[PDB]
Symmetry: D6
Subunit: 160 residues, 12 copies
Amino acid sequence: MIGRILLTVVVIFRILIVAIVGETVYDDEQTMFVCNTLQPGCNQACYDRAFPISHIRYWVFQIIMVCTPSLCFITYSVHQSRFYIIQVVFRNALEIGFLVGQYFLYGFSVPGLYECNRYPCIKEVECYVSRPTEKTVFLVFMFAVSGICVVLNLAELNHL
Amino acid sequence: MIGRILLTVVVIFRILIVAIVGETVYDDEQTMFVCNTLQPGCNQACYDRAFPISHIRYWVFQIIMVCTPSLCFITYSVHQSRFYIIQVVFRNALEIGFLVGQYFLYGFSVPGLYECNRYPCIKEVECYVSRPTEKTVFLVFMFAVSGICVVLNLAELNHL
Amino acid sequence: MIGRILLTVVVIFRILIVAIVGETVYDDEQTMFVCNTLQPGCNQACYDRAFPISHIRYWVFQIIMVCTPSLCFITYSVHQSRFYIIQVVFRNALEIGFLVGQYFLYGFSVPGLYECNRYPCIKEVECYVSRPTEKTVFLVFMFAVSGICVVLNLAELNHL
Amino acid sequence: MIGRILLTVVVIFRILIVAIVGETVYDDEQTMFVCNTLQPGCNQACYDRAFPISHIRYWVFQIIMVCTPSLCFITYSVHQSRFYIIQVVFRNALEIGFLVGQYFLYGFSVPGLYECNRYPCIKEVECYVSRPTEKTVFLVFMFAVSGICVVLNLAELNHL
Amino acid sequence: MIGRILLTVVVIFRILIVAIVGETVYDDEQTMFVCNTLQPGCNQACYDRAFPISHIRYWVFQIIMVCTPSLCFITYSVHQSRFYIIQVVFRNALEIGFLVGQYFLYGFSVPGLYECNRYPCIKEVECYVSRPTEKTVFLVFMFAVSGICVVLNLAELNHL
Amino acid sequence: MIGRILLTVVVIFRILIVAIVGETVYDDEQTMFVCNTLQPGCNQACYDRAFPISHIRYWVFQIIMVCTPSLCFITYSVHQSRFYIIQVVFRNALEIGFLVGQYFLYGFSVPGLYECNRYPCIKEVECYVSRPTEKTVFLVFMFAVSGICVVLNLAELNHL
Amino acid sequence: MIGRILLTVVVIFRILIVAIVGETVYDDEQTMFVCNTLQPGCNQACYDRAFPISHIRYWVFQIIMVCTPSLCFITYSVHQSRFYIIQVVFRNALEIGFLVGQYFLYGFSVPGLYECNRYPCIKEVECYVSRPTEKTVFLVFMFAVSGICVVLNLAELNHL
Amino acid sequence: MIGRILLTVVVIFRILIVAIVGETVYDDEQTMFVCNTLQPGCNQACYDRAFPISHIRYWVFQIIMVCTPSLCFITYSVHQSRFYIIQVVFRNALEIGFLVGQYFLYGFSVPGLYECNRYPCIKEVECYVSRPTEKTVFLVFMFAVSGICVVLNLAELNHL
Amino acid sequence: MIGRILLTVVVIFRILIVAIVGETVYDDEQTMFVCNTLQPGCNQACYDRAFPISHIRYWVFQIIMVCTPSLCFITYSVHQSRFYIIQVVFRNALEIGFLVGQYFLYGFSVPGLYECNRYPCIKEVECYVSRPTEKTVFLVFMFAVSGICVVLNLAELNHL
Amino acid sequence: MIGRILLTVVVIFRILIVAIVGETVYDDEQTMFVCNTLQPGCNQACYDRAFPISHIRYWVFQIIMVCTPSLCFITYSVHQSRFYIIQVVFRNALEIGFLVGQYFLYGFSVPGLYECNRYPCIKEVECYVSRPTEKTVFLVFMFAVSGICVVLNLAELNHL
Amino acid sequence: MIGRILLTVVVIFRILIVAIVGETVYDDEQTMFVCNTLQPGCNQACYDRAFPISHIRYWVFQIIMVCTPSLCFITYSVHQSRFYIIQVVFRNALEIGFLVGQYFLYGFSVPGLYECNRYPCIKEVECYVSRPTEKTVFLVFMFAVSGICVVLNLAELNHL
Amino acid sequence: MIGRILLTVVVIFRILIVAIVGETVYDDEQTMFVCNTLQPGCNQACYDRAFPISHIRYWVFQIIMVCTPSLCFITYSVHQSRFYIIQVVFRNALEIGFLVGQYFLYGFSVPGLYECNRYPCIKEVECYVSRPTEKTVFLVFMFAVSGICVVLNLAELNHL
Ligand SMILES: CCCCC/C=C\C/C=C\C/C=C\C/C=C\CCCC(=O)O
Ligand SMILES: CCCCC/C=C\C/C=C\C/C=C\C/C=C\CCCC(=O)O
Ligand SMILES: CCCCC/C=C\C/C=C\C/C=C\C/C=C\CCCC(=O)O
Ligand SMILES: CCCCC/C=C\C/C=C\C/C=C\C/C=C\CCCC(=O)O
Ligand SMILES: CCCCC/C=C\C/C=C\C/C=C\C/C=C\CCCC(=O)O
């Protein structure tokens, strides 16, 4: 009983946190990225190698993707127990996959230094990241929230 | 039955994905485009030759264009089975044409280097693109979604 | 019968296209305009001579102006066949005048080079435009939409 | 009868024109203002002397000020012919005063050159304005609209 | 009777004026502040000494603070003559205090020059302000509006 | 009785103050941060060491976190005295913890100078902060509001 | 009799004037030559077109060339009236030819402005010369001295 | 008797002073000449107008010119009282003319500021001279030496 | 008889011309060499490829080398007809070899443009030379003098 | 007896020291003089105020001036005991005057900082000198040598 | 017999070649040395590591050192066969040692690229040399001359 | 006997080495001295603290000073065994004192890094020296030569 309330509260909290404040930490991600070199075009290559995909893009995609089964169920109901089981299983699988993917993609920390050896950069150069601590805190917070969501989903699945 | 629900869900998902996050990857498309030269006016010419039309503009136009028949049908109903068949055929043709056009215009990847030989640039110069990986991922995702939409439309057409 | 539906659909489509995407192509119109000279104040004069009025301003003004008769009719009705005829004639005249004015003002293409001979620029200098292809495509699209609107208005006028 | 409808249409048209497009022509008023000198602080002084108050600020203030009597009448009615006469007289006086003030403040054209002789600028220097033609067109359009409004108000006043 | 209507109109007018146009004059307050020196860090110190708190921040705080008693009364009524007297007294005191505080903080004019003698600036340097005339006009207008509000509040207090 | 009204008023006042004006003081936090050195990458490291987390982020997180129990209670009621006691205790604990955390994290003032000795900066360098006075005022105001909230919560807890 | 003394004095005076002070006016001929353009390589082309050969080089060559017959006569005498006549004729011819060549090459004045239309310069540009007045004075002085020398040589030739 | 010794000593002293130290004060005459403007080509024009001919050039020419009669007399003697008288008269005339010419050309002081109104400089600008005091001292010293020389020459002329 | 005198005069003339004026045309050979690129190190490589050895170095070496046999003969005489013949043959061979080498190394003209395709320069770039006309004139003059010397040496060789 | 030898040795030593090494310490006197300001023309004024006359110029003038009586005596002897006495007195007076003048002009040390308050510099600025220690050592050494010379001259004067 | 003449000629030729032209190739050795980095102080360290001692310094030292025995012999003779033998042996040893030292120090070629990994340079950077070809030619020429000198010295030693 | 010859040879060798090549290593001593900071005036102070007196100045002074007794003896002889002894003692003392002074002033090596903590430099900064290896080699060579000179002087002193 309380599990559903907690799940809804956690989902809304995650959505609000991502929407309100997330899109400002990464505003100047590339403008403040500097490398120690004179070669034109090294900054772009090194930034693209360091950060292939931004964290906020991944989190937005995950948020939108993990809420499709509810829309499908609502649409079916409007047009109108098996659907419940199928959607619960799909939600659990989606959440677990997204959590594992985040872990394998980003890790647990954002270092303040990067070593870049991509053309046109000559040999290996050093580049400096902007705001590592805030991004590390964001990473840890999102991981914790996703873990709580996964735990609640598994508990609900095992209830039936 | 389920086909209509899936089609609506896919359409709404595509619209949301394009609207929320698409208009930020391409924000600094031209500000971070750099060429290796001293000649004034080479950057503008080379950028215009590399990217005649931005991806987001094309996707917005496609999204708006593929939803006209529904508006026409709604307007006719408000003023008030042949119309259904005609609009289904028109939608299928529009989707197929837009998919083929996207493929012929952009391809499947965005390279990180460009070779530019347009006046006033002297002989051939080299220019460097910003964020190739994110744009490649966006291209592949949009192509997949459009393919799914085309498949569903063809299935619905063949149902009757 | 279908003519009214098509006219409304075209009007709404034009309004949406102008509103959503139009105000971003011209965002950096003057920041990326460069001339080959060292004289202060030549860039401003040459930009003002090349582009006295931006396209988006003209299109917004046209959109707002071509929808006044409907507001007048609605206001008269709220306060409450001759008015219908008068407003149809006024709309036709406004649309034709705006189309001819656009043609005489801008033409059909935006060249990538400009020759500037305005004070304080010494003799004749060369300046380079930003994004000619997108603006040419926009010009052609708007001209086509306006032509379709004019054709439909003339057909409706000749119906009675 | 038609006079009231025309007055309302003109007021709404003016408000929409000012709101939608006005706040973008003057966005870079000071960033693109350049003077021919090396002295620090001459640009700020010369810009402040050339343009003490921006046009858009004046127009917004005028728009907000010329619509107070209607609010007063509505509030009195909610709390609940002399009030009608008093508010008509007040509106006429406000409109005439604002028109005369605009004429005495700005004139009919915005020149492309300015001569500046304010400290710390040494002797007389020359400064260059950005977008004179668009601002001149805006000035003329606003003057015409205000004149039409004044004419309609005087006609309504003389009706009774 | 008319006093309440005038007070409400003045309050709404002040709120609208502050909200719509106020937040654009001060947009580039610090970017266009220049001092005549080569020492790093002198600009920040001199700007902070010249303008400890921006005018718009103070005005927003005053606007929000002078409308608390109404919210308290509304909340008490929803939960449900002494409260009326207490809230009137509180409003009068708040308005008078804010007016006196504004006068003691800012004055009546914004000079175009500042003399700065704060570390790390060596001896005394000169700095140049941006847009003094507009800010002076804003100061005078806000002072006049606040004075009118205080007069009306005192009249209402003395009525009973 | 009055305690609930005061608590609600204080909460709404805090939310409005944070939302409307807070997100503009810290807009240029990193762009105007300057250090006295020539070494690339020293600015980023020194800024990250001086300000690990921005104040506005912390305040937004606190505001969102201190209002979860109300949402939980509302959800339980919609699904439908112990819950009241539990949520009151949780709110008190959350507020006290957040206040103590703010005190231990930030303190009571923002100095205008910082001493930085982080790699790649050689030995110890000096960096200069932007807008210390406004941020100090914000710190003190937020601390006072939070203290008032804690006092009211403790009073309500002791009432029962 | 006096003619020989005057000729020797004039020759020595010319040599001393050229040697001592001539090689310093033209020291910064190319470093202070500036053109109004941004195109790389325009300065070199325009300087080479304006001044194919420096004046001092021509004068040094003339000085060395007009004194060969004396060396030939001295060498013949050391090895040891016809030779006298032949060398006088040769000297007269050399002096006349050099004077006419100087006139046809340089003229009588050095203007302070030049119009340059050589690749890579686009269309026609303007360039600014350094020290026109000193070079004009030098030109006139050298022409006068050469004329006096020619007159004396012709007088000596006609004596016999 | 002593007059000849004093004249020879003064001549040798003047020659040595001019030769050894004179050619270093004016080494950076044009490199350190700065004008307050942004217009290319204003520095060259203003420097040429301020200093048409350098002082050292004039002094070298005067030194070389005032010693020709001695060379003529020596040459005549080698080839071998009227010549004595003629050369004395010529020397006196040359010295007086050169002194008057120096006075009319340069004056008695070198100011530290110049007002320049020559094309391409717009209106009147201000330029700053390098080393005024040393050049003033040099001017006065040379004038005094030349005056002493003239006095001695006149005394010798009047002796016979 | 006259041949020896002419040969000595030509040799001395060549030596004087090379010594006095040659070492100033090439003073700024590398400082004024500019290439159209942003790549560091392209200027050095392109200059070294365009001008492996300077003309003046070659001419100085040739001048010193073509006068060794005279020194050898003088030394032998001091220590003290076959030697005469041997040294004449050696001189003729040296002069012919140096002339042919100059022709094969440099040619007859110095172009004003160079095409450079050496690492690190990307593809082919364009570089601009300084003072082509003076260097071409010098080349032609030196070639003519060397040819005259060779002709005289051959005539003397054939005399015996 | 030994006094004459010591005087000659000291004079030659002073001349050699001044000639060989003196003219290199002051080579970059003005190029390395920097002031903390942005105002054009402040560097020239402040340098001219700090160093009206260079030390080396004064020392060269003194060296040349203190050796005139010997030249006068030599000239009189060539043309050919009172002259001896007169020249000794003149030399003593010249040396004493030059020593006192040096002391009153320069002092005993060259500080590394200067405070400048001359137009166009605003208020008082700070400027930094180049090579204070070497110049101080030179000052002390020259003062000591001049003192020794004065002592020897006085001893010789008192001998007779 | 001829060996002594050849040795003297070679020595004088080497001295002249080194003196006249050698001191101009290396004039801009360090000014045109560029490295691809932004770190201050990397250029100095990398230049010092690449070229510890300049070639011209070594050659001058060798030239001066290999001619001491002749001075010693001349001094002994002036003061006035064993000395002959001793000085010949010393000269041979000195020449052989200097040749071997040159070979071990410099080699046979000067590359156009250098790899630098000295503090403060981060990891390994690339630097570009100026005029490699001329310096290689100089190296080879000096080596050949020194070898010829060594051969002649050994022949003379073996003669006795 | 041989000792005098060796002493003269060493003295002449030292003089030649110092004169010919010494004055070029230190030509750019201050132009290539760089410190890691942004503060104006830190470079001058740090250079003056690192190198109070240049090595070449000290060596020139020592060379000139150690040869005074010979001049005194020559002058006494021209005017014309105790003098011999006195001058030998004076020379020995001068040489020993100069050697010890050099050791105490400079040491044995020139490091490539310097730590500077002089006003206006903030705290301690790092500066980079130019050409440490050449200067170290020069130091060692001069020390060795001076030691040899001292040894020879002591041997000569002990001979008698
Ligand atoms: C300064 C505050 C303004 C923030 C503006 C930023 C973004 C727009 C708002 C939300 C987008 C962010 C995250 C995902 C939110 C909603 C997805 C809809 C899900 C659904 O419907 O199933
Ligand atoms: C210029 C004014 C515009 C400001 C835009 C900025 C931010 C968007 C608005 C609010 C976010 C700021 C603070 C927290 C507010 C609400 C949290 C929701 C709490 C709940 O629902 O429990
Ligand atoms: C600052 C003064 C130093 C000036 C140095 C400049 C040049 C060197 C001197 C002279 C060269 C100039 C002009 C021609 C002079 C002599 C030619 C020799 C003629 C002959 O022998 O038949
Ligand atoms: C401004 C004029 C000063 C020029 C100074 C330049 C160079 C020094 C002089 C001459 C060197 C140039 C060319 C070759 C001359 C002589 C070689 C000696 C031949 C021999 O002895 O067999
Ligand atoms: C442009 C030409 C001027 C060149 C000036 C350069 C240097 C000065 C001259 C010579 C120094 C160079 C090399 C060695 C020469 C002589 C050493 C003396 C040997 C001895 O006496 O035993």
